[PDB]
Amino acid sequence: AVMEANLGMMKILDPGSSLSDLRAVAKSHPVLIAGPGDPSPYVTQGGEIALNKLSQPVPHPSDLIPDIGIERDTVRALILSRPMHPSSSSKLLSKLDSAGSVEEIRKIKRLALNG
Amino acid sequence: MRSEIQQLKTSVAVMEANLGMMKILDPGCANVSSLSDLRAVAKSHPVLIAG
Amino acid sequence: SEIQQLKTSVAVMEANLGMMKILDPGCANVSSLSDLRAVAKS
Amino acid sequence: QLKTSVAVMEANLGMMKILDPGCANVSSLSDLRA
Amino acid sequence: RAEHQIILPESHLSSPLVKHKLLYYWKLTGLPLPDECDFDHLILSRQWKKILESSTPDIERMIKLGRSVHQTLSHSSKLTGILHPRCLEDLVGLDIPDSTNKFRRIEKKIQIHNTRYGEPFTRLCSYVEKKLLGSSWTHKIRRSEEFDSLRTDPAFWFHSSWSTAKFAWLHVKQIQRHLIVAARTRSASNKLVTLSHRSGQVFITPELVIVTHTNENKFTCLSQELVLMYADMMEGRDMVNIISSTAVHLRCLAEKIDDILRLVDALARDLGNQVYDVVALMEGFAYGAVQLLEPSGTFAGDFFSFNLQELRDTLICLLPQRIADSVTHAIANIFSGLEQNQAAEMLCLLRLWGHPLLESRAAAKAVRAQMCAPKMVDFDMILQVLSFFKGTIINGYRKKNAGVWPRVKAHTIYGNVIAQLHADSAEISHDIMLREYKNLSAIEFEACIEYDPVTNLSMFLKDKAIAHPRNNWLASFRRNLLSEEQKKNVQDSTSTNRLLIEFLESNDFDPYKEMEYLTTLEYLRDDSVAVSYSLKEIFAKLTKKLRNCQVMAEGILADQIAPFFQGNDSISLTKSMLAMSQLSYNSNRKRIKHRRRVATFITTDLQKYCLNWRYQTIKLFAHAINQLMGLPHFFEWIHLRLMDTTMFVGDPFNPPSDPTDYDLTKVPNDDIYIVSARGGIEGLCQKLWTMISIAAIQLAAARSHCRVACMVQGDNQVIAVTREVRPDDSPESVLTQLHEASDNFFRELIHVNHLIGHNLKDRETIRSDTFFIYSKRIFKDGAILSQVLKNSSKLVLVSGDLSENTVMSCANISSTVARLCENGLPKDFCYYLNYLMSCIQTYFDSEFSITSNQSWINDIPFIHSYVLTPAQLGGLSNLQYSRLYTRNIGDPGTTAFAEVKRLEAVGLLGPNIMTNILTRPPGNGDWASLCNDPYSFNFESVASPSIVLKKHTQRVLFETCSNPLLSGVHTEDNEAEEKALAEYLLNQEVIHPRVAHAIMEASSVGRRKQIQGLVDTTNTVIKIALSRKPLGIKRLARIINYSSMHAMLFRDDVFLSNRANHPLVSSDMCSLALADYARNRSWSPLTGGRKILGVSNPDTIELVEGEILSISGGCSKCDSGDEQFTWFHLPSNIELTDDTSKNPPMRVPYLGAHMSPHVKAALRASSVLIWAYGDNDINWTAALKLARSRCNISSEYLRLLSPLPTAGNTFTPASLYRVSPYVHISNDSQRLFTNVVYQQIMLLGLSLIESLFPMTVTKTYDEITLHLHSKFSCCIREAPVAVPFELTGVAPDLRVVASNKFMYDPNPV
């Protein structure tokens, strides 16, 4: 009716990773200045405010933007530390140094945790 | 009936005038507040606005 | 009735505008023993 | 009446975020009291 | 002089490590600084050409020390100045042969101790175990191989890895403490000790210790509390090595710990001070190795992989990529392969590299980055949390006040749902709080809570520092370091700036006028308010008025509003937490709609919790509590004051680096400053934040449609999300429902904390089906998970600073060894370990002393019988063998004589010592000393130095007390009233010390003692009160020579005596006959021959004669005519590992109004006085005159309000709970103790059950049944005839002031 004549939306972009999905999923809110200070370093040309993981306005939104060693060490920790029959533990450790990708380590992780 | 509708229209007319004075943020940052608002407000006894 | 629901929907508007007003540190002399509709209407 | 009330609800109550523009810069206390 | 030998230097680290104290003393000598300190902000700015011309002794020692150190190094190369922690690995291997040969003199005597007394210790332990377990278990009484390794290697403390550096750093520490004591005296002695180590030297002064390596041409400098940090970490990691390599279930850890230590030492040479960003992750690797052992495939290895990724990410920024990979692989192989307890034991690796060097500028940057940040919080989520906040307030007030809502404004009750609950005063459900949140958040209250500003009174008596105001803030720093116009802005401070002393001296103190500092907004006009921040890694420093209002606000919230949210305290926290992990999956799996409830756990820690609260988030919650109290403006003060003020991180060696800073309102948001802070400070306003966190947790519970049992103490929050299942429901379905509930709740908790401005992580929070983490203990499947190595790291060798006290040092050793025995160790190992460590203690105090004993320190049977005789009788032993099984509730005298009788029987303690204790000459003795300390003997003894200094400062600080609150506390005749009351109570026909202790504690005399004992007598307070009034000559000579007088008094009384007047009782009678003989003989000059009675209780080990039944059953006692026993049963085939599908049901084992408290104490004194002496008119007149001192009741209201005459006159768990949650107790065939004694028997029985299963055992195999038979004991006595009489004499006057709310109740009840 006569409601959008005063409340200016400000297009907040909470990340609830590129700049496209941030602009795509970004609800517009009428933000209300309560504390003292200057909010001008945190808005952007176009009226958009990017929030942190602590709901903190950030100066530029680009602040908001695998491995095999860790994934093999953790599955060694799962084979070594869980209760398991000692032949089967040595068999799962045998076909783990022969791995060569992140895939087929995840097969052992779902092969060890499922027995 | 109609009198309560008149009070609803008057109360919404008060609400739109109160939202016209709040510091809603726009691109440009016209209505900001300093730290001297608290300093000028704290110089007196805390007041009762109730009614 | 719908008017009786509009009354209790219009009343929490002022009770929320008084809440938004007392969040400002410049509204620090607003005593807590005061109606938030009365804070909103002032 | 039923439409302008929900127009105040959607932009007043559900969508309302509260900004505290904290002094994340290098400026003295007497410079913030200006 | 002798006044300087009272408050000794601290022997252990109690303070942070300031970098610029060390760099002040480094620059003050002419040595080159480290190369990361060339462009330092404080070193390049101070005027050293005036500092070095002060010609104080503190600078002359440094200049002479630099001429000493520089002379030994060479000019052919570059002198390097390596700073901590880049010198961990070199000081790790420090090897002074002058301290090795000085500890080998102690080792040579401990080996003679073993070869003379180790076989009677075996005989003792086998004796007590054969008595408590019967002679049908006698083919299973062997000493543990922990005990046997302690028995073959007596010098466990001397022959481990890390022992040579432990020797060297303890000798360097004791030399530097001696030099500080010598430098207190104005003298001209050579205060420079040079030791020579393997390839280098060590230079010791009261301020620096310099270690020089001469082949590498390097040196390092260490400050006063940095050699304490090195000494503490050396004996800590050495004792961790000793305990982990002796204990059988820990021997795989020992090598691992050496690896995990030495590797990180090698990182400290090239990570530097950021190596403690690696050390901080070590805790995480102990929490992820427990989560490897999950019942499902979910949650397993999530936090482990997260910490391994964090360790890689911290290493790749500083190291090469290959070394980061190899170190990450090494950390991954250390923490892998562990058990459930062995993974929790690796929480000892926290304080084991020590602490970083702190500075104010980096701490202030870390605070400004998060406390001056902008925030954007959602208003609707504040309304939802406020709805649950106000609904929890309404339900809590309704529960407390018998079904009545708070006084709600009638025009603020919106809708038809809350207006219907208001008329019925019905309890609001969480679903109505979520549905009707727009109507429940908008509700207002009225003044319907009568608060009380001063309630606790112990929080106003704490030794908290007060910041001197902001026109004098440059007195925060050392005046030597300020600039020339910064020295002109420093004034003299007449105050002491302590909360205690400036609370006592502040007359015209009205609490309701001190709260007007906040309600009237006068804290915000006031231009003298300064806040100072402290160096840490929880503490600030406020001004006087603002600290008073903060203490009041915390007390008011914790007294009135905080129990509405339930807070969700030692036994009741191992019953609310040990029963909370009974809800886990593996606790009830043999059991597996709405029949049986299970839970899965979420331990969350919020990122930067206290300094992300804004005024915009907390304002409506503070508004609700202000309306509920009737206060215009009280509970939102911290954000409004810190927005308007500037604060600084205060440290005496860290001044402002700009020499032209004089006024705080003009300094930039820079160096040490936080200008207009918007967050909160930790500890301040904690109760409000905990309540808002509970409201958010219950909101996340209702938004995800589940029930939740939480527990939150700030940023550490523990949630059990619960789910009700069928017994015939499949275990896969139970695990699936728990995982879905934990996922839904955890998403909603993320969501409602992000919108009120907080961050708990998606990966750092530990979610688990099995365990949770509370007070840094892991609670896992109804059991507490072991931390023996943490307690081993604190098994240290000097305790306290108030004198050279050996008794208190051996007492700390005994308490730590008892805490080791509680975390599951063999009993014989802990008992002989305490003997050997107490011998190490008592030989470490004749040598290595920083301040006569030549006759008795070379006497091995004296040192044996002096460390093994109990402390109640004059020896050093604060560990009876009964304390290994249970708690010390009972009579200390009968336990003392029972241990002496056992030690005499097995051959440890000689026959002379028993008869010399029995024929011991009596002490001075008063009726007041018998009343204030019952269970006590009138033996000649020296008073403990801590008791004397504590009592002196309590008597000195209350001489200048002037405030109207607590005005009648310090009277001029309180000692005369105490002597008169004790002579009235005790000097009767029948002498009862315990009921007289109860009466005097319930009167105004014990109330004065209780109020004066609330003051915080720290070392600074004791220094202040000794400066304001000196101690004397006799008392101070007793403080200084306390240990020699204690030892020579043992030598004269009970070790070396003739005693031709042989006593009546012999050494073979029961120990309570012995203790009654010793009391009746010792108090005989005071008493005159009457029987001090009503005191002694039987020792629990001496009382019972246990028996474990055979396979067929039947006991050799009950075959001999015995019927009185307690029955203990343990079911067969109990798993103690994750395979809990066939375990018996687990339960919590056995562990142990509406008036003013003045009327409660008065009625308690009335009940005790009529119960103990008689019930007639003179006894009731005396009961009236004693109860009249605390309240204002009349004679007829005593007789209809006094209770019936009765016998009423996790931080540290009692034990691990592995097989004690399965034991069944029947105290049915024993009818004599159906009382304290059957509690002792039940606890002894549970400790004997769990003693049967060492930590290497995960499965039971048979059934165990105990009969604790106690019928044919020598220590069984029938209760005597209570003979009433009239109290001869008249009761003392017991005058009282009427204005005190803390000592008197003027209302006629």
Residue numbers in the entry:
A (entry chain E): 274 to 289, 294 to 342, 350 to 399
B (entry chain D): 262 to 312
C (entry chain C): 264 to 305
D (entry chain B): 268 to 301
E (entry chain A): 8 to 544, 553 to 583, 588 to 611, 629 to 887, 894 to 1194, 1209 to 1265, 1278 to 1302, 1310 to 1384
Quote the study on this structure.
NDV RNA genome is replicated and transcribed by a multifunctional 250 kDa RNA-dependent RNA polymerase (L protein). The L protein consists of the N-terminal RNA-dependent RNA polymerase domain (RdRp), polyribonucleotidyl transferase domain (PRNTase), the connector domain (CD), the methyltransferase domain (MT), and C-terminal domain (CTD). The P protein adopts a unique tetrameric organization and interacts with L protein.
After motion correction, CTF estimation, 2D classification, 3D classification and 3D refinement, we obtained L-P complexes in three integrity states: the full-length L-P complex (Lf-P), core L-P complex (Lc-P) and core L-extended P complex (Lc-Pe). The final resolution of Lf-P complex, the Lc-P complex and Lc-Pe were 3.41 Å, 3.0 Å and 3.25 Å respectively. In comparison, the structure of the Lc-P complex contains the RdRp domain and PRNTase domain of the L protein and P tetramer. When we analyzed the Lc-P structure, we found that the solved regions of each P monomer are P1 (261–301), P2 (250–305), P3 (259–312), and P4 (274–399), whereby the P4 monomer contains the largest number of residues built into the cryo-EM density map. Our structural analysis showed that the P-OD regions of the four monomers form a four-helix bundle. Due to the flexibility of P-XD, this region was only modeled in P4, where it interacts with L. Analysis of the complex structures showed that P1&P2 (P-OD regions, 261–289) interact with L, while P3 (260–312) and P4 (274–283, 308–315) are bound to the helix of P1&P2. (2) On the palm subdomain of the L protein, a three-helix bundle from P4 (351–399) interacts with the L protein near the putative NTP entrance channel. The R356, D357, R366 and K393 of P4 form electrostatic interactions with E301, D309 and H336 of L protein. In addition, L362 of P4 forms hydrophobic interactions with L299 and F306 of L protein. We did not identify any close interactions between L and P3, because the P3 monomer interacts almost exclusively with the other P monomers.
